[PDB]
């Protein structure tokens, strides 16, 4: 009893990509459900869903970052099944994220408070699934940043591949090599 | 009291939305999936399937240019809207013939198109939506946009119908428009 | 009994601004609820909500006109609490609105019927909250107009600062000084 066959589609809008959710039709799923997307015998990527009116029923919309991360191409047939988080080990305890300005062009020398970023990160991504290596778009203080999940650990009653962000998940940031990003605060690696 | 409700025809919020071929409304007036009969004037009624979107002004119904052309509507035009119910076997689509062509003169490649693959996806995205003979639609397939014209529709015989509901076993047959460079293939043709 | 701290965000699209609602994540609120946005210790603003998939959880999206009116800047922290209309005095009896073309480039000499405008205004804004001094965007006959709430009065069993538009609320328009706007109809000042 595998998942259903669907097609990868492009993201309806740029703003939507800030969600880092796989976007779907309300006819197929409801927001908040999680899915495991099988692209081949070598990969099963986990996404958290969010509905949008423009998504064609039978398709799943992905932003550019997600398509790169998941090695997806528009039109591609994918196998999709509901994924359930139901074990303590799956909740994220700590997670390390590599950050940098999205547009290598726009780069300010202003100092950014990581503790503030960590709090907002937890706020907008609460109950969403993340995996080591995943690339995301993060909107902070009206600026766009690129994020790379470097590590994830569960709460010791350690290392996990994928996990659910919860209210007490700890996020530590660190700029990418050669980054002109000045990070301040205690939410730094 | 029994007749429909008075509303205004509005523009479609986005291009992407037009791929749905649904009349788009406010979640304040309707819920997605309901069907409506839109009266423009005596002797002229058009049936649409609804889909909500946050940007639609309450009291208005959004239509894409092609829908407005077909229903002969103009922006701001006042219309009479009433819920329409499909509840008779004769209304389910058995077979439907569609004339296809690239939506844009621009992109016009000569590659092959499996009418069987298109038919399946058509049924997939338009399941439970209403279509009428003569209706013009926008169809997204393989990252390419095509224009569709509903030529004929027939009900199942336990024939010819004006409007019907697409269901899981509805059969769709395609046929390119005259002078079309559409390289159709497969067994889903007229 | 305080509200929750959130951040002001940009409006996902231009079309959304026609709603004049504060837009939110379906994860935080449901459409139709009303909120009081405390921007500072002496100022609280009232908005009616509408959900949209692109709004980042933990944030509230506002159009430029709304940000100007409530003195908000993007990323700004705000305290948000549900607001309840539950007293007769809060229902709008009459309201005076100053109207003008939204943009210079869109100026013309066509006649716009106030009675028609009033009816459509009540139609699209029914059950939404408005305050004296609030500036809105109004779409009428495929044209965009700027609106300024000049006055609001309750039904005498008078003057109120904020109120809920209901089915029998009366709206009177008047053009801005020097407005080349051509207003007809009886729903005037």
UniProtKB/Swiss-Prot annotation, chains A, C:
Extent of the signal sequence: none
Residues carrying N6-acetyllysine: 105
Compartments (UniProt record): Cytoplasm
Highest taxon above the source species: Eukaryota
Purpose: Required for vesicle-mediated transport. Catalyzes the fusion of transport vesicles within the Golgi cisternae. Is also required for transport from the endoplasmic reticulum to the Golgi stack. Seems to function as a fusion protein required for the delivery of cargo proteins to all compartments of the Golgi stack independent of vesicle origin. Interaction with AMPAR subunit GRIA2 leads to influence GRIA2 membrane cycling.
Similarity comment: family membership: Belongs to the AAA ATPase family.
Self-association and partners: Homohexamer. Interacts with GABARAP and GABARAPL2. Interacts with GRIA2. Interacts with PLK2, leading to disrupt the interaction with GRIA2. Interacts with MUSK; may regulate MUSK endocytosis and activity. Interacts with CDK16.
Record's protein name: Vesicle-fusing ATPase
Lineage, highest ranks first: Eukaryota, Metazoa, Chordata, Craniata, Vertebrata
UniProt gene name: NSF
């Amino acid at each position: 009893m595998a998942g259903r066959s669907m097609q990868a589609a492009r993201c309806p809008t740029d703003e939507l990509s800030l969600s880092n959710c796989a976007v779907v039709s309300e006819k197929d799923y409801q927001s908040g459900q999680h899915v495991i997307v099988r692209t081949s015998p070598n990969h099963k990527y986990i996404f958290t869903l969010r509905t949008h009116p423009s998504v064609v029923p039978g398709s799943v919309a992905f932003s550019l970052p997600q398509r790169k991360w998941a090695g997806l191409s528009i039109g591609q047939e994918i196998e999709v099944a509901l994924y359930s988080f139901d074990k303590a080990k799956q909740c994220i305890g700590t997670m390390t994220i590599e950050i940098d300005f999205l547009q290598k062009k726009n780069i300010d020398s202003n100092p950014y408070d990581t503790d503030k970023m960590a709090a907002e990160f937890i706020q907008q991504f609460n109950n969403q699934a993340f995996s080591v290596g995943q690339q995301l778009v993060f909107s902070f203080n009206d600026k766009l940043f690129g994020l790379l999940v470097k590590d994830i650990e569960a709460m010791d009653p350690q290392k996990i591949e994928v996990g659910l962000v919860v209210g007490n998940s700890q996020v530590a940031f660190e700029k990418a090599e050669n980054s002109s990003l000045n990070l301040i605060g205690k939410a730094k690696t």
